[PDB]
Design a protein around this ligand. Structure first.
Ligand SMILES: Nc1nc2c(ncn2[C@@H]2O[C@H](COP(=O)(O)OP(=O)(O)OP(=O)(O)O)[C@@H](O)[C@H]2O)c(=O)[nH]1
Ligand SMILES: Nc1nc2c(ncn2[C@@H]2O[C@H](COP(=O)(O)OP(=O)(O)OP(=O)(O)O)[C@@H](O)[C@H]2O)c(=O)[nH]1
Ligand SMILES: Nc1nc2c(ncn2[C@@H]2O[C@H](COP(=O)(O)OP(=O)(O)O)[C@@H](O)[C@H]2O)c(=O)[nH]1
Ligand SMILES: Nc1nc2c(ncn2[C@@H]2O[C@H](COP(=O)(O)OP(=O)(O)O)[C@@H](O)[C@H]2O)c(=O)[nH]1
Ligand SMILES: [Mg+2]
Lengths: 99, 430, 50, 436, 439, 430
């Protein structure tokens, strides 16, 4: 499989490839060293949790022109929850043991 | 010993780099990790030529990458064989040149010499007995010719006894990529004649001319164009890195191909190349090597080598073969084509034989020649420059960052004179 | 320099090099004392110890 | 470490900005909420139009401006409420109502202060900002007046950094207002002396493009945005995708602006083939480029043939190999119906990007494998300035509608100076083209 | 690497293009929707079809043809017929108002706005081809839009492309049978317009072909469809040499350098043989001598002109099938021996022969029989002067009283264009008279 | 050694190539794949005369195929033995010929001639000792005559001593293959006479005449006619390739067949030929062989050979034979037909022996002689040419590509002059 490397012997244009995003030099080390033995910690659940608002009124006749065309793209629905970083949700949680 | 260190400039400089190391790495048997797996002793015999030893078994290229915009050094290190370039030597600013010969050579380049100049000096201090430098820079690119020439202007200032080599990609007339191509074409050339020991001209117009007619491959790419060139540079210095019959160091190339001080531009090419449909039906004998070497369509330059006369030429045989036919065949070419070779330089072809052939073939040859035809390239570049300057078109971009149009006029006089001087001997007789 | 060497009728190359030699204010300023006043026209430049 | 901050002003600017943002969202996989699914890693190409917050979501480096709060509110209540920074969609309390003097001397100064502060912060985070993209409408009072003032301040504080503006002058014969000739002419002096590069985007030309190819007989402004959306997509796409031949934003004012005054160039786009029958032709690069120079597909309503070309730079994206481009370019010179100016032998800046064109959901454009966008500064541009010339002179003949500008604090004599600027600009275009 | 582009303008042009393109689709095995037959599965098809069709890269084929007309009826019929998926959607240019038999209308008032679209489509078609041999045009002369747009497009193409060869299969009115009333006017005007703009013009009046159908095909109630089928067969016999191997090939360019003695003389009449209904074919042995003698029968001419009344200038005949050269030579010698067929003195050699191997194909539902041999004969003769003389007389009979002229003078064309056309026709008749005199 | 190269032009020129290499390929025993399965070394003693050498033992034709239109060239590729030729030797235009000498000799063929001259020059210099050329082109075609003749004209200028072999196809009036044939014919001869050394005129009538009264076969294609000629070509070249009693190359043939410098149009034929139903009773002996060789009807030129006086002729027997029964026969013919041979050149028939008869037979003959009967062809062409020119009909085309009137007047006078001299010898007496 060490094919003879001479000009015109190995096609270059990779027709089989799909994505060509440019990885920056800064994170080049990011995908080889840092994230190999590390994790952004977790989004764990909670034992005691005990639902967004109504959004029940979406009349189609009174649909503003600027909204009926640009529907939520790439989303199953136009979600309403306000994202927060990992640390935000889990504030002030603790576990304990004795040894 | 007598190793060299490479300086590549500009995006065109970086991409062209991305290949020869790859091919250079291929011949020595250097794996991407840097772990040696060659088969014979020869591949490691002269590893110092393009690598220094580092603890851990993987080999450090003596590469210095320069470019005003970070992207080029970004992609070069992302694809295959991109991890061999070791991060310390990377140098990049924050601005980019925008094809402004002014921007890359006085505005930003002038501000950056410090770090890059520091690193190169150290690497040269590393080598045991320095041989010279090689450079890849883009004349039609503002930054390349801009940053590239200054260092080249700077480098000769401190290494008076080291030969200097420069591969140049001048813009062809047919297909153009930049509108400011004429202006930056002359300015880089003017500074190139006064400092470079050897500069090689390669016309992108020819390559595509070379690819369609010889390689007959349906869909080339800049990788392929890079492929062709990358082989040549390995062609010039190949014999130096391996034992052989007639060792011919790059300096010896300077001895036998520069007639006078100011005519230090040559034209080169690589062969033989076969097709997807002709590789099995051609012939493999010495006559084939000589037949294609002088063929018009193989020279990487837009100038046809028949519109003028060869002042001198050199052929570096690669691989084993009967020297009888190497010397005799040249005697075949010289005699039947006297009119095309000046008559006061008898025996005006250089020959060399190297014992290590390219990976996968039996015979190989690389060609370097200084021909009068090159006047065609400078005139059209010269002719174009006069066309735009009479109307002061696009003059402001260069006038508003420190320059005066007197230098532009000064550049033309030298460039025009070289064109006139270069052609004086064609009508001269003995 | 460009239109400066033509200004004083001196070679283009020498002027640039001449520019560097005067430039090293640090070397003459790194040492102690030696206050300076570099005016050469409309504006004046002064320096005490530092 | 590349950053381009978008500046928008005016409903034409906002809606065009609105539409173009969905296209940029889908391309990088940015979900509407602002969190990337992603999963590897790396591929931080989204930086060009986004900035990390250290941990979590991402934001568009854009500022939306306007004086009439209704338009901005709709975006604030639409699907994209979760994307933009709450305190960057500045809104006022009153509108200008096409009284350009209103947007320049009366109502604008109460909003300029905050806008300058915003541009302060957004650039502060970047490292190598290439410039700004300014989208605006000249056929409006509030948009233009803010559109004018903002342009002036950008040069003063920063200076040499790049600036690009996609203005939309009124159509040859189709107009939305009746005071555009005043606001159209008076803006020119504002935009001629301050922006390096600007492009014409006359609306009624696009209607021809949409009607002739897509086969939609009842288009709307929304579709007009998308075609403009792709135009910006290809020009900047070279800066966030690897390729064989790159181009930079800074590398346009150095291949399309022969002199400071002449900085108006026209656009064109192709292919635009409806999927209904898109696959009845081969989509070869040979056929694709020809559509670029075709007079019927010019983005702005001017016949390019009436004058000479000065410099056209074309950007390629798709699976086009440079071998094809070299051959096709030769052809354009050969034709005897298209000619170049005497003093410009080489005038092409060719760029190529591998990434194919992204087809947005709910759109009309079909999916094709190759496309090319042309940005050329041609002598034909005299038409737009020629036609606006007559309208301003005639309607100004008897001081019609002047009384609304006198009483707002704008000097009557100022209109005296503005007319000359066109005269000064008009003469140069003819002057340059004559053979030597 | 050899391609042709066909231009069809007018109702007659469209209705003959349909018959041509059904035959071309059938001959190369392409089904109406543009794709190769689904099972296929023989593999490796040789792409002869490049001459008429264009490959889209994966799947269907797009013909290199363009249809023009100002009335939308026939174009809508084409777009709703079985071949709706074959042609490209935007190469079927259609107008809104008919020309109404007025030459001045389609040449000065409404024909000018369609010519730009047509020329654009032609340009977009031309760059795909690399070996473009030439253009073919089909147009009914005795009509308004046909003649008008034909003349206009020919005038534009003469300067836009220059030396590229053009062939015209025009249809002049019959000597006494006609459908219109002002056909001599636009007939003469179109003839004057294309006299200096077309390389080859072929006589195709309907009365002669009606006689051929009645006499040979044993059809007592023929319709235009049979006429178009015969015309398409002639086209196929003419262009078969470009896509099928043969013993002696001929090109489109090797036609108008061999049948044009002088530039003004480029009108000729065609013939085809054998045209036999199977009822009789079963009886005869249709050899090559029989078919080549039948090709010269004056009653078998495709035009209502008698070659016995004039001399021959140049004769070209193309063979296809299993013909051998020796029998062709033996038949040509016999024809030269015959006394009732005489050539002009200054043309000693007056035959060109083309030999092809592909036998003619049979269209299902057609009238012709399946045979192994056929010949297509194209000859230039002195006898064509009579049709011009008759047309001039018919024109003069009305022009003496300036009848129907206001319908022409009111639509942009001046009064004097009739006089110069009459002078040009008189000069044409004078030249055709002088060319035939013995030296 | 003393090898030759072949170049062919035109459909007739091309077509003969497909058959011509077919018979030559089998004579030495070359298969469709081209590998050597030859039985006896007699098939390889002089193989290089018509083939080169490459890797794997595959032997490649010394072929150069050139035309204006590709369609005819396309067909030659797909048939049997269509895989021997290499692509590099091929050339093709894009506009076609149109049987118009102008487009073949001044405007179109001018642009493409560079490639053929380059490709022709590549083959010749490589060969050991070039001996001559064989041109097979058609006079009845536009691209044939135009590109063809101009190819003959140019070659002579660069090469002083190379011999030439030209096989043409003159059109006979009966088979009017092209109305423009008369004009073309006169133009071709005018150029030919000044540079062509040896030309063998073969009338298509004889090929048709031959096919019926000699072979007695029902339905021949142009392959058979192509088959008939191909035998003649190999008939002359064999002696240079195989062992024999008196070796005689092409040039040795010339010295004995052209009595004066420009009376050099010869007449060729083949024998013995017999039909399927008549090839069982006759006796196969050279005495029967010679009988069919001199008989006029079998000769392959429509010019009756009994209406003129023979000047020079050559005999090239094939197969084994004793000196006696061939020589004594030849002496017999000279005396018994005294009135038919000129008086001021005695013993004016040449004979030679070749030791390898054609495969599948026992004896054969190939004849070439200079006979005054050839005067019938030019005059009859001469009369036809004047007929069409007195009315200027069809004259416009040639004037449409830079040509001019006095060229035609000059050409007509020479051909009228050439016929003038070729007959003054007929009545000459000692
Ligand atoms: N391309 C495009 N232009 C638009 C669209 N809607 C309005 N315009 C342009 O906007 C111009 C008039 O200005 P306005 O739409 O009123 O926006 P404005 O200039 O900020 O003025 P105000 O509405 O008072 O804010 C018209 O001439 C149009 O050219 C649109 O949907 N697409
Ligand atoms: N041979 C033949 N001739 C036809 C056919 N159709 C129409 N024609 C001729 O065309 C003449 C009238 O012109 P049309 O073809 O009907 O219409 P046109 O030429 O497009 O001109 P307009 O009527 O203005 O549209 C008649 O006299 C016919 O001789 C046809 O199918 N076959
Ligand atoms: N053949 C070839 N030419 C190249 C390549 N990269 C750049 N060039 C040439 O370099 C020119 C553009 O140079 P540019 O990128 O502006 O140089 P920069 O200033 O360093 O960015 C083009 O005209 C090309 O001809 C390459 O990979 N192959
Ligand atoms: N005997 C014979 N003659 C041929 C053949 N092919 C072509 N010709 C001759 O070529 C003449 C026509 O010339 P043409 O085909 O136009 O030559 P081209 O233009 O160079 O291809 C005819 O008169 C034929 O006699 C062939 O296979 N056999
Ligand atoms: Mg508003």
């Amino acid at each position: 499989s060490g094919f003879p490397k001479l000009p015109g012997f190995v096609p270059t244009q990779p027709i089989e490839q799909t994505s060509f995003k440019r990885v920056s030099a800064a994170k080049q080390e990011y995908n080889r060293d840092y994230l190999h033995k590390n994790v952004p910690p977790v989004v764990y659940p909670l034992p005691r949790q005990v639902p967004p608002s109504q959004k029940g009124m979406f009349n189609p006749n009174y649909m503003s022109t600027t909204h009926d065309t640009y529907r939520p793209v790439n989303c199953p629905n136009d979600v309403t929850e306000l994202y927060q970083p990992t640390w935000v949700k889990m504030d002030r949680q603790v576990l304990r043991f004795n040894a | 010993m007598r190793e060299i260190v490479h300086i590549q400039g500009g995006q065109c400089g970086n991409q062209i780099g991305a290949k020869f190391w790859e091919v250079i790495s291929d011949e020595h048997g250097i794996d991407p990790t840097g772990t040696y797996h060659g088969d014979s002793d020869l591949q490691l015999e002269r590893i110092n030529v393009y690598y220094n030893e580092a603890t851990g078994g993987r080999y450090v290229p003596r590469a210095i990458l320069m470019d005003l915009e970070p992207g080029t050094m970004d992609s070069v290190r992302a694809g295959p064989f991109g991890q061999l370039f070791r991060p310390d030597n990377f140098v990049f600013g924050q601005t980019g040149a925008g094809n402004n010969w002014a921007k890359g050579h006085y505005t930003e380049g002038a501000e950056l010499i410090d770090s890059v100049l520091d690193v190169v000096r150290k690497e040269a201090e590393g080598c045991d007995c320095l041989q010279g430098f090689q450079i890849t820079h883009s004349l039609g690119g503002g930054t390349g010719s801009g940053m590239g020439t200054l260092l080249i202007s700077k480098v000769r200032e401190e290494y008076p006894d080291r030969i200097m080599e420069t591969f140049s990609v001048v813009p062809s007339p047919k297909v153009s990529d930049t509108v400011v191509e004429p202006y930056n074409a002359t300015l880089s050339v003017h500074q190139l004649v006064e400092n470079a020991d050897e500069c090689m001209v390669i016309d992108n117009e020819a390559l595509y001319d070379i690819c369609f007619r010889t390689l007959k491959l349906t869909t080339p790419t800049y990788g392929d164009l890079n492929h062709l060139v990358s082989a040549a540079m390995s062609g010039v210095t190949c014999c130096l890195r391996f034992p052989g019959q007639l060792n011919s160091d790059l300096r010896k190339l300077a001895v036998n191909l520069i007639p006078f001080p100011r005519l230090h531009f040559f034209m080169i090419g690589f062969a033989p190349l076969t097709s997807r449909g002709s590789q099995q039906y051609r012939a493999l004998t010495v006559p084939e090597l000589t037949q294609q070497m002088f063929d018009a369509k193989n020279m990487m330059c837009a100038a046809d080598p028949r519109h003028g006369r060869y002042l001198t030429a050199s052929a570096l045989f690669r691989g084993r073969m009967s020297t009888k036919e190497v010397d005799e065949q040249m005697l075949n070419v010289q005699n039947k084509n006297s009119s095309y070779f000046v008559e006061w330089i008898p025996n005006n072809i250089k020959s060399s034989i190297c014992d290590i052939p390219p990976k996968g073939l039996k015979m190989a040859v690389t060609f370097v020649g200084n021909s009068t035809a090159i006047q065609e390239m400078f005139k059209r570049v010269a002719e174009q420059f006069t066309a735009m300057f009479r109307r002061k078109a696009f003059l402001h971009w260069y006038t508003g960052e420190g320059m005066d149009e007197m230098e532009f006029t000064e550049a033309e006089s030298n460039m025009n004179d070289l064109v006139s001087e270069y052609q004086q001997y064609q009508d001269a007789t003995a | 320099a460009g239109p400066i060497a033509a200004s004083c009728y001196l070679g283009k190359d020498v002027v640039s090099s001449a520019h560097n030699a005067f430039i090293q204010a640090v070397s003459d300023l790194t040492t102690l004392g030696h206050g300076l006043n570099i005016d050469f026209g409309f504006v004046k430049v002064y320096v005490q110890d530092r | 470490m590349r950053e381009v901050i978008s500046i928008h002003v005016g409903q034409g600017g906002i809606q065009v900005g609105n539409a173009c943002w969905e296209l940029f969202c889908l391309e990088h996989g940015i979900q509407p909420d602002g969190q990337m699914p992603s999963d590897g890693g790396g591929d931080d190409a989204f930086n060009t139009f986004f900035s990390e917050t250290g941990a979590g979501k991402h934001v568009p480096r854009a500022v939306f401006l306007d004086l009439e709060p209704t338009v901005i509110d709709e975006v604030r209540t639409g699907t994209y409420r979760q994307l933009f920074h709450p305190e960057q969609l500045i809104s006022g309390k009153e509108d200008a109502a096409n009284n350009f003097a209103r947007g320049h001397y009366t109502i604008g100064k109460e909003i300029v202060d905050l806008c300058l502060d915003r541009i302060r912060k957004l650039a502060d985070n970047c490292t190598g900002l290439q410039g700004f993209l300014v989208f605006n409408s000249v056929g409006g009072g509030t948009g233009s007046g803010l559109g004018s003032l903002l342009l002036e301040r950008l040069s003063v504080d920063y200076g040499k950094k790049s600036k690009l503006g996609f203005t939309i002058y009124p159509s040859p014969q189709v107009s939305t207002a009746v005071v555009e000739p005043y606001n159209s002419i008076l803006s020119t002096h504002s935009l001629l002396e301050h922006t390096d590069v600007a492009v014409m985007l006359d609306n009624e030309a696009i209607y021809d493009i949409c009607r002739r190819n897509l086969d939609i007989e009842r288009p709307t402004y929304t579709n007009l945005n998308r075609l403009i959306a792709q135009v910006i997509s290809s020009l900047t796409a070279s800066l966030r995708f690897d390729g064989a031949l790159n181009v930079d934003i800074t590398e346009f004012q150095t291949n399309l602006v022969p002199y400071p005054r002449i900085h108006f160039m026209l656009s064109s786009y192709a292919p635009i083939i409806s999927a209904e029958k898109a696959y009845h032709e081969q989509l070869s690069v040979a056929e694709i480029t020809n559509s670029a120079f075709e007079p019927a597909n010019m983005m702005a309503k001017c016949d390019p043939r009436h004058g000479k070309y000065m410099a056209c730079s074309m950007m390629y994206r798709g699976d086009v190999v440079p071998k094809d481009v070299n051959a096709s370019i030769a052809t354009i010179k050969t034709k005897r119906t298209i000619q170049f100016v005497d003093w410009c032998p080489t005038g092409f800046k060719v760029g190529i990007n591998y990434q194919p064109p992204t087809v947005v959901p709910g759109g009309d454009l079909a999916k094709v494998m190759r496309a090319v966008c042309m940005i050329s500064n041609s002598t034909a541009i005299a038409e737009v300035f020629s036609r606006l010339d007559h309208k301003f002179d005639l309607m100004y003949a008897k001081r019609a509608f002047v009384h609304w500008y006198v009483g707002e604090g704008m000097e009557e004599g100022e209109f005296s100076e503005a007319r000359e600027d066109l005269a000064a600009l008009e003469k140069d275009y003819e002057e340059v083209g004559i053979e030597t």
